[PDB]
Design goal:
The protein has 2 helices and 5 strands. The chain is an alpha+beta fold and about 120 residues long. It has a single domain, classed as top7, de novo designed protein (2-Layer Sandwich), CATH 3.30.1710. The chain has a 5-stranded antiparallel β-sheet with strand order 2-1-3-5-4, with helices on one face. The longest helix is centred in the middle third of the chain and has 22 residues. It starts with a strand and ends in a 14-residue tail after the last strand. The PDB classes it as de novo protein. Keywords: Structural Genomics, PSI-Biology, Protein Structure Initiative. The assembly is monomeric.
Length: about 120
Amino acid sequence: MSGKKVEVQVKITCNGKTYERTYQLYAVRDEELKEKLKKVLNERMDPIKKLGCKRVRISIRVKHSDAAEEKKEAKKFAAILNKVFAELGYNDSNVTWDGDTVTVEGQLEGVDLEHHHHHH
């Protein structure tokens, strides 16, 4: 993988405002971009939970570098995101791609939906 300087726009709706910001994320390695997503999300959502909401509507649009690369890199970046949201407490169904953007929702404050009671 090349040193991918991508523009990642984290657009999060909470309370009654939408907070979007274009971040410049540089990663030579795939694992590097994973932990950088955990950085940007966990840091930015820290005051958001304090602002207080029942649920947040997040929309992370990744910039497509080059037409040859971006077919492979967005498919790879789908897997990258699936790791990060799983590590932050967002469900698989909550993560859905539409309009070259990933729309991820999470139940704010009470950040859990899967209250499983399985016998054996």
